[PDB]
Design a protein around this ligand. Structure first.
Ligand code: CLA
Ligand code: CLA
Ligand code: CLA
Ligand code: CLA
Ligand code: CLA
Ligand code: CLA
Ligand code: CLA
Ligand SMILES: CCCCCCCCCCCC(=O)OC\C(C#C[C@@]12O[C@]1(C)C[C@@H](O)CC2(C)C)=C/C=C/C(C)=C/C=C/C=C(C)/C=C/C=C(\C)C=C=C1C(C)(C)C[C@H](OC(C)=O)C[C@@]1(C)O
Ligand code: KC2
Ligand SMILES: CC1=C(C#C/C(C)=C/C=C/C(C)=C/C=C/C=C(C)/C=C/C=C(C)/C=C/[C@@]23O[C@]2(C)C[C@@H](O)CC3(C)C)C(C)(C)C[C@H](O)C1
Lengths: 187, 47, 188, 70, 215, 49, 193, 40
């Protein structure tokens, strides 16, 4: 009865244990107000966008660029692309995919009782497989990518620096690269 | 008149320009029938 | 449970009919227009658009090269020029006679005469007279026409965008190297 | 959020509204247990409470700014 | 001031052509008195292509409305239970119709009507006016016209709403140039009404426990 | 799949004039089907006139 | 189909499926077939590319004109990397057109390598059985039928040789490209490369 | 254009509007082609 993630609260009844990535984590019981399949579709869409966003941001900031594109960091990349003109072009496939796969799938999820689960577009051209562990890996990687993208944007905007997105670079991730001579002093 | 085939050629080759830069958007939008004032005024029937 | 063969994550709709009453049924209808409109009307519109787009793209490509002695206009200004001359009035008149007869046929077909969606019976040369080849030729007609719609759209849009006659390709695409591997700069 | 005082006013307004609000005669300030409130209304409780808390907090913040403070 | 507004023309058949009177601007026609010219000037319409395309949009909406009327009686007609949901109807009409209508019109004003009208009052002829799509996203030009725009939406999300004083005003009176209400005042008006209606539309009960019962 | 199509137009149904004993009745050319509204004998009299 | 039955396990990696990562374990069977088909495609492409790059670096070019006014020596003088750019646009347009035809024809055969076909076994006579298209019956692979004089065991041995040469060819062609791009990355590549 | 729609078009007001439309158009065209005829 008690939630695994929160051992001082009762888990909701909608979560159960069949869904991939289920850790009994829903303190606000949002699964009761919001349908679980709709919420999972939103979660997977966000996860996928954030994964693509993180990898693209990291590559463009590290230096990989398309020919004819402006040689700018990922922070100014949006403004540079809009100024140069080719950025509605990327919206066009986004608009196509959304209008012809999300709206119908969303309506099927809400209305049709027999429908594929949230985020399941049956898109497996290579046939790698939709195993339970594979879906769990998808969900975990996606959530980590969501939080990573949030941090990456909020830190790149704050510091306006290179890939580490910290004020002193890798030294902040690794304190003992800073001095260690004060640590040895207190010792 | 020019009967095509009898007293004139049949299909006649068309006049063409050998490539060229992209015309600016305002160059043809300002003359288009639907997104130009004069184009709209000229996009009317006649009799 | 039948899933649409074009979008296997959506259930077939219902108004699309039995799977396969119409040649080309790959269940592609994400927006469900078949619920609002009748399928026979939609398919008549489909074949009309297919045929008109085919003739339009072929005419655009042809007029880019050759024109009759009287009409000395380019393909873009041909519409205005021949409206001023009066030929497009003649085309509108005759295609309107044909379209009034066509509309009478659509009315009869929708009210239940028995006519198929776009079967005008036009078959002088005898193509598709054998029933075995008729379904395959309907599917080929639909495929070619649905391609021709995008073909004509690309034709017109790229023609106006570039200003070039046949290929509808920018000057850098036509002249320069579109298969280059040495590092490019800022402009094409 | 920018200021700490603005945040304090917003958070205090939200807390006050959430603890004084009544829905169908059920309020924390009128001796309704938090468990009963959550079981009855659920996330609607917090959503309405913070919505009106944001309204009253925005009013208070703008008024305090107009008077002179924030 | 000198041009008499006219948007109707008679045909010469039986002598009625005199009714195409001198209305200024090298145009002969019947003078109108509906104020639509002033309405369009307030809205920021400066070209005839805009009028043509909004007319086409209106025709499309009329066709959609005929289709909706046919559909909601011949294909999928609601029930009396659906019709008698007066509480949800009031909620959606207050917050959803009136509130979002006012919010959208306030956005339209702030983004397209204030700059075009200010430039017209300054003296820029309609040909040289930057187009609404350019104005919508060109934040540098909008900062040039109204300096508060260079601060972005942070002064909105944080409650430093005083930064938008330039294009959201309580001036009152009439603009001396046009002799009409200030369009910044009208934008602030519609924004405040949008907030008021969205606040009012959360009163009546629905699927969730909160809300009032008019009974 | 029209059961009784017009001879002139296989894609339109047979007009009343097609199933008639007039000269030229074996053509069925009446897209507007004015033979249904107009008496066929009167219409043929006017045609010949 | 399954990695246990597939070829390619060599001696260089100890008579064992060399999958340091868990790719084969994690993926399904048809993913393995796709990987094998792509592996063979990469190996064959890289073998041709490596031989052509070595020829271009050695400056060995056909006696004649690649195009009227453009000699093979003219395009080859600057180097291997720049020769492709020096080629006129129409010639490589034709090359990419025939490669498009070859790829589409090989993909259009119905016993697909993913759906019950041998992965890496490109169908000979790829332009055969296609309505609205006639081509001479010149086999894509072995038009002279060299493999006819080989036994099944010999053919398996030569398939192993194919795979082990193709992997080296991928390594070599990427070495050539990397050496040309970043000088000093790949030694044994003089200024001619 | 079923028999029911033909019947509806044959109804009295639709027919009145159609015939008076044709009559008014006839009069107006006669005015355009023979204008200002205060005599015979
Ligand atoms: C009544 C006048 C008339 C006459 C006598 C001709 C005669 C001729 N035309 Mg034609 N032509 C005409 C009007 C006429 N044309 C018109 C009005 C057009 C515009 C649509 C054309 C467009 C045209 C083209 C584009 C070409 C010709 C050509 C020809 C010649 C080839 C014959 C052929 O292939 O016939 C084929 C005819 C048919 C299969 C029957 C079609 C007509 C019936 C009545 C339906 C022939 C001398 C060709 C030429 O120049 O050859 C040197 C050629 O390329 N004509
Ligand atoms: C969507 C269909 C379409 C439309 C709307 C037009 C419209 C036009 N064409 Mg035409 N054209 C078409 C298809 C079309 N074309 C096709 C398929 C061809 C290839 C045979 C041509 C070849 C063509 C030429 C060579 C020329 C035009 C020209 C013109 C203009 C004057 C009409 C004329 O002489 O047509 C002529 C049309 C034909 C001879 C085709 C008749 C056959 C039709 C498609 C029916 C086939 C099935 C029976 C006008 C803008 C003239 C112009 O102004 O050029 C600048 C002109 O010189 N067209
Ligand atoms: C506790 C903190 C606080 C403070 C210091 C203020 C201070 C202020 N508020 Mg108030 N306000 C508060 C809380 C506070 N508010 C809260 C919680 C809300 C949300 C309900 C509001 C909602 C609110 C509104 C909606 C408005 C104000 C306005 C004002 C200003 C003028 C009040 C006045 O004299 O009206 C005098 C009013 C009358 C004599 C009666 C008016 C008769 C009506 C129009 C009929 C003033 C700066 C007004 C403002 O800023 O105007 C510039 C204004 O419009 N406040
Ligand atoms: C945000 C949601 C929303 C919106 C925008 C509207 C809008 C409208 N409703 Mg309402 N309605 C809603 C929710 C909403 N409704 C709900 C939840 C219910 C069920 C309880 C109803 C039940 C209902 C009924 C029973 C009726 C309406 C009608 C209307 C129209 C009122 C007349 C008017 O001023 O039209 C303003 C028109 C426009 C601004 C043009 C916009 C057109 C579309 C939306 C684009 C208007 C279009 C009346 C109607 O049928 O009018 C057509 C009507 O009789 N509505
Ligand atoms: C409903 C009304 C409304 C609308 C629609 C807008 C719209 C806008 N306001 Mg806001 N605004 C409003 C009311 C409204 N406002 C009100 C009432 C106020 C007064 C408080 C303000 C005050 C205000 C200010 C002060 C500013 C804006 C600005 C903006 C822009 C914000 C961009 C953004 O957040 O993207 C949201 C992005 C997403 C949700 C993600 C999706 C992104 C999509 C996919 C991009 C699509 C791009 C497009 C289709 C193609 C453009 C191509 C280009 C080359 C032309 C945008 C034009 C800024 C601006 O640009 O000013 C000129 C600005 O500085 N507004
Ligand atoms: C000028 C424009 C044009 C025209 C008139 C056609 C006409 C045709 N296409 Mg289409 N097609 C076009 C452009 C065009 N295509 C383009 C650009 C593409 C590639 C993007 C295609 C891709 C395509 C496919 C994939 C298929 C067709 C097919 C067909 C044929 C339908 C079936 C048939 O009659 O089989 C009997 C007729 C023939 C076998 C035609 C033989 C004619 C040869 C090729 C003439 C040589 C070219 C000539 C100089 C022009 C028909 C002849 C179907 C077909 O069966 O193709 C053969 C088919 O499956 N087309
Ligand atoms: C662009 C189109 C194209 C493509 C992709 C291929 C692809 C192929 N051809 Mg080629 N071929 C083409 C056009 C094409 N051909 C044309 C137009 C002809 C003329 C009819 C031929 C005639 C032809 C013959 C006669 C043979 C090939 C062979 C081959 C295969 C081996 C390649 C090879 O030996 O590399 C080139 C490598 C070298 C020259 C060096 C080899 C050195 C080693 C040590 C062996 C000695 C390969 C699948 C060969 C094959 O299948 O072998 C079994 C083969 O015998 N082709
Ligand atoms: C006329 C008709 C003629 C018919 C011909 C038929 C025909 O040819 O068929 C095609 C054919 C055949 C055949 C047969 O049919 C025949 C004839 C008889 C039949 O019984 C059997 C078969 C087999 C079916 C074979 C083809 C094989 C090919 C092309 C292999 C291509 C292979 C390229 C590589 C390895 C490239 C390697 C590059 C490297 C290593 C790059 C590099 C370097 C170096 C610089 C070098 C060194 C450096 O090191 C340092 C720095 O330290 C490291 C590195 C990486 O930088
Ligand atoms: C993949 C291999 C390949 C094939 C299978 C193939 C087949 C055919 C056929 C079919 C039977 C014909 C009829 C044909 C004709 C011409 N080919 Mg061609 N060709 C191939 C490759 C290249 C390359 C690389 C070039 C090239 C060229 C030319 C020119 C020169 C025109 C000129 O002198 O300007 C002409 C006339 C050169 C070029 O376009 O130069 C601007 C050039 O560089 N081709 N080619
Ligand atoms: C098939 C189909 C449809 C369709 C269609 C379409 C779009 C068909 C289009 C057909 C088309 C485009 C046909 C052009 C003919 C041009 C002719 C005859 C030109 C005459 C030209 C003449 C007589 C003269 C020209 C002159 O220059 C001459 C020689 C001398 C000069 O002094 C000047 C003049 C001007 C006098 C439907 C109905 C829409 C739906 C249905 O479902 C499927």
């Amino acid at each position: 009865a008690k939630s695994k993630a929160i051992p001082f609260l009762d888990a909701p009844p909608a979560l159960d244990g069949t869904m991939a990535g289920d850790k009994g984590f829903d303190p606000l019981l949002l699964s009761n107000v919001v349908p679980i399949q709709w919420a999972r579709e939103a979660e997977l869409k966000h996860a996928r966008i954030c994964m693509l966003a993180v990898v693209g941001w990291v590559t463009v900031d590290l230096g990989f660029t398309v020919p004819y594109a402006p040689q700018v960091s990922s922070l100014a990349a949006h403004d540079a692309a809009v100024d140069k003109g080719v950025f509605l072009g990327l919206l066009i496939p986004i608009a196509l995919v959304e209008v012809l796969a999300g709206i119908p799938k969303c309506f099927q999820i809400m209305n049709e009782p027999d429908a594929s689960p949230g985020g399941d577009y049956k898109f497996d051209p290579l046939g790698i497989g939709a195993s339970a562990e594979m879906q769990e890996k998808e969900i975990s990687n996606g959530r980590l990518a969501m939080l990573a993208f949030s941090g990456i944007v909020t830190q790149a905007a704050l510091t306006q620096g290179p890939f580490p997105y910290t004020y002193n670079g890798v030294e902040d991730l690794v304190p003992p690269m800073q001095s260690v001579q004060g640590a040895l002093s207190i010792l | 008149m020019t009967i095509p085939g009898l007293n004139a050629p049949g299909l006649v080759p068309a006049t063409k320009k050998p490539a060229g830069a992209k015309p600016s958007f305002e160059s043809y939008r300002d003359t288009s029938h639907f997104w130009s004032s004069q184009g709209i005024m000229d996009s009317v029937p006649k009799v | 449970v039948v899933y649409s063969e074009a979008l296997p994550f959506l259930v077939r709709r219902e108004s699309l009919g039995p799977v396969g009453a119409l040649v080309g049924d790959v269940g592609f209808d994400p927006l469900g227009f078949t619920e609002i409109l009748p399928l026979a009307w939609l398919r008549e519109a489909e074949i009309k658009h297919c045929r008109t787009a085919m003739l339009a793209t072929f005419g655009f490509a042809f007029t880019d090269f050759w024109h009759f002695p009287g009409f000395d206009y380019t393909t873009l200004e041909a519409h205005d020029a021949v409206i001023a001359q009066g030929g497009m009035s003649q085309l509108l008149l005759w295609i309107g006679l044909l379209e009034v007869f066509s509309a009478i046929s659509i009315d009869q077909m929708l009210r239940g005469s028995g006519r198929e969606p776009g079967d005008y019976g036009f078959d002088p040369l005898g193509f598709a007279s054998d029933p075995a080849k008729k379904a395959d030729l309907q599917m080929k007609e639909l495929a070619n026409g649905r391609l021709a719609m995008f073909a004509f759209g690309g034709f017109v849009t790229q023609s106006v965008l570039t200003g070039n006659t046949f290929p509808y390709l920018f000057d850098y695409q036509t002249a320069g190297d579109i298969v280059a591997i040495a590092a490019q700069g800022a402009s094409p | 959020q920018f200021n700490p005082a603005k945040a304090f006013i917003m958070m205090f307004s939200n807390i006050l509204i959430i603890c004084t609000m009544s829905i169908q005669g059920k309020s924390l300030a009128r001796g309704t247990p938090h468990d009963e409130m959550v079981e009855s209304f659920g996330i609607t409780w917090l959503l309405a409470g913070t919505s009106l808390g944001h309204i009253v907090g925005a009013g208070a913040i703008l008024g305090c700014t107009a008077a002179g403070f924030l | 001031t000198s041009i008499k507004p006219s948007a109707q023309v008679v045909w010469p058949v039986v002598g009625q052509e005199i009714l195409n009177g001198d209305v200024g601007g090298g145009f002969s026609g019947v003078q109108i008195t509906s104020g639509v010219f002033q309405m369009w000037r307030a809205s920021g319409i400066t070209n005839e292509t805009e009028l043509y395309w909004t007319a086409m949009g209106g025709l499309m909406m009329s066709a959609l409305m005929v289709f909706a009327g046919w559909f909601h009686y011949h294909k999928a007609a609601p029930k009396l239970e659906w019709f008698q949901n007066v509480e949800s109807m009031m909620n959606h009409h207050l917050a959803g119709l009136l509130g979002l209508g006012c919010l959208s019109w306030s956005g339209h004003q702030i983004h397209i009507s204030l700059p075009i009208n200010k430039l017209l009052d300054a003296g820029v002829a309609p040909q040289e006016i930057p187009l609404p799509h350019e104005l919508l996203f060109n934040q540098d030009l909008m900062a040039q016209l109204y300096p508060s725009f260079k601060k972005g939406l942070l002064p909105f999300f944080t409650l430093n709403w005083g930064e938008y004083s330039d294009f959201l005003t309580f001036k009152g009176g009439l603009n001396p140039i046009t002799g009409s209400l200030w369009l910044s005042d009208t934008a602030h008006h519609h924004l405040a009404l949008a907030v008021l209606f969205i606040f009012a539309g959360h009163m009546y009960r629905t699927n969730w426990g909160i809300g009032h019962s008019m009974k | 799949a029209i059961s009784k199509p017009s001879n002139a137009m296989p894609f339109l149904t047979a007009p009343p004039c097609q199933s008639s004993k007039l000269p030229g009745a074996e053509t069925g050319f009446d897209p507007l089907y004015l033979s249904e509204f107009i008496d066929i004998k009167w219409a043929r009299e006017a045609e010949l006139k | 189909a399954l990695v246990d039955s597939m070829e390619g396990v060599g001696e260089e990696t100890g008579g064992q499926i060399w999958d340091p990562l868990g790719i084969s374990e994690a993926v399904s069977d048809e993913a393995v077939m796709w990987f094998r088909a792509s592996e063979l495609k990469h190996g064959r492409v890289a073998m041709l590319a490596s031989v052509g790059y070595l020829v271009g670096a050695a400056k060995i070019s056909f006696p004649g004109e690649l195009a009227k006014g453009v000699t093979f020596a003219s395009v080859a003088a600057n180097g291997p990397y720049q020769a492709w750019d020096a080629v006129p646009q129409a010639g490589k347009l034709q090359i990419l057109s025939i490669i498009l035809a070859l790829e589409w024809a090989t993909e259009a055969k119905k016993p697909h390598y993913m759906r019950g076909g041998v992965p890496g076994k490109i169908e000979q006579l790829p332009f055969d059985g296609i309505q609205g298209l006639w081509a001479p019956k010149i086999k894509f692979w072995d038009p002279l039928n060299f493999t006819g004089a080989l036994s099944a065991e010999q053919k398996a041995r030569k398939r192993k040789a194919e795979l082990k040469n193709g992997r080296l060819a991928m390594i070599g062609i990427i070495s050539f490209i990397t050496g040309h791009n970043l000088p000093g990355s790949v030694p044994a590549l003089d200024s001619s490369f | 254009m079923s028999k029911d729609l033909l019947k509806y078009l044959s109804t009295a007001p639709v027919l009145l509007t159609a015939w008076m439309s044709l009559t008014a158009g006839m009069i107006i065209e006669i005015q355009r082609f023979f204008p200002d005829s205060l005599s015979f």
